[PDB]
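Dissemination and training. As part of the outreach component of the grant, students in the summer workshop were shown how a complex can be specified as a set of sequence lines and then modelled as a single object. The example used during the hands-on session is reproduced here so that future cohorts can follow it. Participants entered these lines:
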Amino acid sequence: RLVQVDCPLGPDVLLLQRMEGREELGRLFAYELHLVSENPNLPLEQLLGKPMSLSLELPGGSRRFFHGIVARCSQVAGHGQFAGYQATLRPWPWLLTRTSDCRIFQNQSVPEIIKQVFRNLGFSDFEDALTRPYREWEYCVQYRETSFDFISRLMEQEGIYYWFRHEQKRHILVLSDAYGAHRSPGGYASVPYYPPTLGHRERDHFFDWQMAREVQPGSLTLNDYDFQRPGARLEVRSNIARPHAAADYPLYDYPGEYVQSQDGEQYARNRIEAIQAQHERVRLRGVVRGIGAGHLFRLSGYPRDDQNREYLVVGAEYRVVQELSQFESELDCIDASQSFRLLPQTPVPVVRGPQTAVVVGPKGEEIWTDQYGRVKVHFHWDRHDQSNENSSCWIRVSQAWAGKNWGSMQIPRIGQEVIVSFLEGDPDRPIITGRVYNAEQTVPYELPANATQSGMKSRSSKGGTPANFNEIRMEDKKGAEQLYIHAERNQDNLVENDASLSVGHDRNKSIGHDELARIGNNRTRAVKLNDTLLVGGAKSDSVTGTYLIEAGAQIRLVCGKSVVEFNADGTINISGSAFNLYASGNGNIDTGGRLDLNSGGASEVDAKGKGVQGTIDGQVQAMFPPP
Amino acid sequence: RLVQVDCPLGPDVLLLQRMEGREELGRLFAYELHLVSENPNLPLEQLLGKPMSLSLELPGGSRRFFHGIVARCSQVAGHGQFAGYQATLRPWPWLLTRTSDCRIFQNQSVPEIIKQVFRNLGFSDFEDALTRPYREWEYCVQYRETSFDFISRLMEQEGIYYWFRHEQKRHILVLSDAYGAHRSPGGYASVPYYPPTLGHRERDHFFDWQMAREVQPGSLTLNDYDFQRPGARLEVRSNIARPHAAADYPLYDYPGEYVQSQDGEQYARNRIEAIQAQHERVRLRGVVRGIGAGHLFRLSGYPRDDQNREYLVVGAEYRVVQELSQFESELDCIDASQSFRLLPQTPVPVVRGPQTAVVVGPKGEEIWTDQYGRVKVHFHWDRHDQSNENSSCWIRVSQAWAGKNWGSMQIPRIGQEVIVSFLEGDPDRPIITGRVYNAEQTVPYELPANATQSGMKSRSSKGGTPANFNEIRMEDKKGAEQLYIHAERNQDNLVENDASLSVGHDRNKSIGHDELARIGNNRTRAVKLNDTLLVGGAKSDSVTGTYLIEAGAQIRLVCGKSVVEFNADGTINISGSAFNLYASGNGNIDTGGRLDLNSGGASEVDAKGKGVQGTIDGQVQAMFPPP
Amino acid sequence: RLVQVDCPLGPDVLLLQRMEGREELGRLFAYELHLVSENPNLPLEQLLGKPMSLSLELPGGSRRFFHGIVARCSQVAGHGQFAGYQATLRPWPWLLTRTSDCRIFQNQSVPEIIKQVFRNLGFSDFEDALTRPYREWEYCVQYRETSFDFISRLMEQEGIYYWFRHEQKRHILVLSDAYGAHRSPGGYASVPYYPPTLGHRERDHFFDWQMAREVQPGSLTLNDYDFQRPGARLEVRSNIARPHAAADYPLYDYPGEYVQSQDGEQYARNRIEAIQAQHERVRLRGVVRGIGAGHLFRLSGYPRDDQNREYLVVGAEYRVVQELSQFESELDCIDASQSFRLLPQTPVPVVRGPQTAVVVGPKGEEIWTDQYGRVKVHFHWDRHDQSNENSSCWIRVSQAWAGKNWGSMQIPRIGQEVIVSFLEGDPDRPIITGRVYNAEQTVPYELPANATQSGMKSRSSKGGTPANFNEIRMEDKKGAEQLYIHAERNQDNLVENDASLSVGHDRNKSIGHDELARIGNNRTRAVKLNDTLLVGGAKSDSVTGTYLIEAGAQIRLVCGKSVVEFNADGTINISGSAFNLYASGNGNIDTGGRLDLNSGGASEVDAKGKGVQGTIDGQVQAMFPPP
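and obtained this result:
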């Protein structure tokens, strides 16, 4: 009689005036449901967005459900017999387009990731019929895209495709990597071909047919780069030849998003097979019902016996017409022994430009890095991360100068706001290209007042304060320029060879404790004018050889009352309270003139107020006054 | 009669054989007309690009105007009686698609900006029927886009739309953000629906009606970030419940282009209104001459009574056929209870990489910055600005090391060629990323010659001449390495605790004026071999405690003829022209052997030319030779 | 009669049942050959990818040759004698879409680059009929695009076109930018027009015509910038006008991708002239067999005199059907006097973000640069070069300060991995924005193990090893802070004003050889406690002025047995083994008490173990102990 609308609100509540079903491997199904009803104003929103099915009398009397979700709907002007209720029926996955995200995945397999999305969604009606094992993707960020988009890209990359199973009350997103996950139609595993020239045969059969071949590229070369093995060559290449002429045009790519040549070949292969599947296509149109995408069936009756064979349907469509059933269907397929693949046509969220993030790591860490200077960050957009070393993977950082164990070293600290960019805008390839001072990260030299100051102030780690720093500052202030040097605790200046110091004006040197100055060879120095030395304690000179005290004018010695004068003319005056001159052997005293004693000739020698400890110390304390 | 025409080259001269028009709220209109004329060579260019209208014979003989500008035209097939001509009318706003530019706006509301654009255009034919106040865009820029594109984006951002309105001799852009901006045509306050089963009615009526339903998202989350207030959780969310199922899917975006979540909500509301408006669509077809886009009317006669409502036409189709006549129309409308916010369908130019900018400010300034180190810059593409502080807003800049009141920093100067990009390529979110040398701004150490020279050279400010600078110059030249420091002023070497200096060879030191040396505690010095000290003035030793002078081989003192020789063998020789040995108390002169006076045993010890002040001077000036 | 087939699988085996020819200047043709053949199972793959030829009978029996290659071949349900097949004939350039890569072209004219591609693919079937000279570009680059796309784009941007010639067995790509490479249409130098209203005039004439007009812009201003001539005003502008209302709408782009304003003007014209042309075009239809794209002929018979002009066919349509027959043609043209201009409609691969590369240069270099500090790099994506100084053009690099011969200067060396970005994503505008470390280019400080020593390392050049370098480090280690300097050779610290040193604790200086110092004024040295000085050799002080020695407590002189004690009470003890006191004039000795000689009251002063020599030497050796 007719195809009964086995749906919500009853079956007979809706009658199938006409249906246009559409199925495709690796894509969302779509069905036009021209359902009609005795209810002249059946509130459309009551089934809009809800699951429903349709029961098609298949071969053997079996039934094909056309289950999906009412994606869209519309009432249609009609007649007292019935009102039209057009509806677009589509599988759960279109719902994934209704939520966008900016979520980081880390070392997770594609199945893991996708299923996790499903777990997040609460999606259960799906099935894992993969045929190829998967590697965990060390980093994979969902970014400015819907879950649908994200997963779709993961799918095409991996050569994954889907088929959906129609069940009266549900519709299963079946994951498949190959024909082994597919099945023949119930009561229709094989079908005759009865060309249109025969009019019609009651057995479901095919009658329309088309075969076409196309020119394709000779090969695909991919390439990539891994800084951890920088000199390694990751270039790969898939070479395929076809029956057509000139099959010799190579394609090249970089980066291919892989670190092993085996992945390069796998993904090149997935892409190539998707392409190769297009080399020759088979089209069929019949009055068949059982067949659909993801089904395996054998054609028979076609003049070409190389067409009379089993096929895996890639594209399928259905036609139902019922006066208030007529039935047609058309296929687009590949041989049943093939593994369907799709090209990565899903758009890639391109990182349009720079985005900052907070440097993070372990909560008790401050310089969270590794041997490459890579760090973890917290992106401002990542509303789902842990703001720690698990918020992202390690990210390389630019330097002022960077070579083989030489160059600058400014390895980020936690809490810094840094600028992240992506290699060719690819969210999975971050790199730090800058650092920005902000309300927290404030400039060493208060701006704009100290805009003329430049250099660097550090901060001790771990746990150093803003006072605990080493620094260098060059004051540019015209007329008051200045080089400030600050060692927070130590200065080791190594001058491997010769050293030189020049001061245009005055030298102010001071040290809190002791100072040792040893000269490997000789030392010579001079003071242009007066050379004064104050000693708060004692003074001791030790020359192994000869020590010459040379001076023009008068050399003077004063120690309390001990006073000695050494005039340039040799008039040497010596005195104090007493004296004792002694020779263990002989002694001689002579004069050029007369020598007398106990005569009053010699007299006391004036100390000039010198040699007084109190005075000396006063000078010393003036030199070293208290702070 | 038929349809009346009113245009350049003659009103009656052209007869509208047929017309296919289209108007939409917030969008450009288009009228395709086929008119015929007794002029067998009607000059296309004399109406192409020109304003003109149609006087549609409304009820009562009133006329509905369809004024527009001939965007396109064509002499087409026709007859000797009336030659055929075709033309496409478009709005004055459409004309903006013919012009493009690169211009920055700063602190202007969208209404303000657009009206200024209108002033630039001379576009006086518009109305301001907006009820909401709009935020001044502190920075917003037109870049490589048409003026139309630019303002279209501004509108969509703020949700602004409009109603094209016509007058016999002009075309009006009725700017709108409110239902009250729209209105019914005279006699079209309530336009009836007279079923198609009636064929045609004498009263402008509708005969078609269609309603369609669509699944909408359920939540919209927007966010943004402010470095000036880094904890600035600018997250904001709009939510909506819909009649259908699956009315709960969340969306997320960041940055939302706002600094206040409330502004974000405006924007969120603009978007969610634009979105939810797609939930249900109402279509009508009739023979109605008056109601079109931006018009109000109550549907009167549709069998489904809850459709006999007042509607606002979102857009409309206009149809003419003429007997050489019937005017017909189709409406796209929303129920009076609904509002409208322009849908975000216009694309935006993206800054896919770095640009060159000039640091600017006051014309007499060298550093134009604020407390965040931000500066204003001038863009090469912004040919409208005067290369000054008004060229752009305060822009953030990457630095060597951001730190909280510490770090490595260098303040930018006016006239510098800098590397600038945008946050995520968004032209309204500028950020300075670096600096680069050029033909004028040459490297500190001229290349390629000075590739071995590295570090940095500053300049004094204001007035940093080539001489006025401080620098760090490191020489990596193999065999001629160096660590050179230049402090054009004072230099402060602070070492909080311990310091050390290692010199592989010789060390030279020279001070232009005096030297202060204050050893907090004890000083120990030594020279492995010889130590020479010269004094150009006087020397003054002042030791608080005991001052011991030891010489392993000989202590010698010479001041001219004053010569004292202390031989290690115990022989003490003292010579000069005279002596005065005196004890305040007693004294003893004893020998183990014989002591003879005027014996001839004592003589004058050779001074060796020492103590000759002139000789000494020779040595001093040897240390301090001219200049 | 008809169009005869000349092809693979046997010329007359295939019968042109229906052919849809499509031609256009500056665009690849397509001839859809619907053929029927006595071969009931004609191979598809043996036409596919192969050249095929047609011989369309013209007046006089002349055969208009067609030639192209099959991009697609399909088996169409047909009969025995006439089995249907469908072939897509494309021009050779179509095949260039089958290959894609990347590559840099330096100092290459576009004509040459084109020919390079031809040689690469063996595409000898072309004719160089270009008339304008083209710029030798220092840098063009193919990237992620087919060779076809690359060249097509490359041509569009320079105003280059490519035309075609159907030889019988070959199809020639007549490259040309001037109408001298056009021809009269095989003897149809003038083609009469017969109004369709006259009926189908029995001969090869036109039966249709359509002129159409459009509103155009009025001005295009482009601008660009060159840092090597940074004051450049490369801004260009070319203007147009049209018959319609004021064609005065300005356009503006920056950068316009040119370094020469003359070139910029041409580029403006490359866009503009086509835009100008967009104003008016003509469609023609007839059954004219010898006309087609690139043909120049006069239409003769269109009622409007203005249309009986010479026209250049821009594009064309052909339909050939055969009975075993009918022919029709239609075309898009411009007046022969109108200059054909190709718009830049091919997309340019956008550099979505940063790239990685390595600094390269001549093998004898370690640093390869120029007067701008630019470098050559080899790119990690550049899988098509040998990695040398010609692997790129000169590329700029960011710095910490870019001033006029001042600022920062870090120098990249050959072998360093670098970050390369492109201005606004423009593949022809590379710049280095950061240096990075990798497995080979390791970090100078161990990480995280030695992240506390912020700073830098270097290598002497040329030929400096890890032991030959200069380095700076800052220990930020909390509680172990330290500044450290390594001058591999000498060090020079210049302070032009006052220098100061403050060491909070202890300081240790060690000079490898000789130290020399001088004070340009007086000097005030002091210690707060003890001051000891050891001289391993001899010591000599030469004070040109008075030399006063002040000390409290006691002054001691020790040289072997020659020892003097100066007590603060003025008791002066001078003694040893012998003495010789001599006045060269008079001598006086007096006491206030009794002066006795050989009294026994004088004795040898205790040396205190000092003035020994060997012991003293040992002390010095303690001071300067062996390694």
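Residues 189 and 360 of chain C are 60 Å apart (CA to CA). Students were then asked to discuss how this feature might be tested experimentally.
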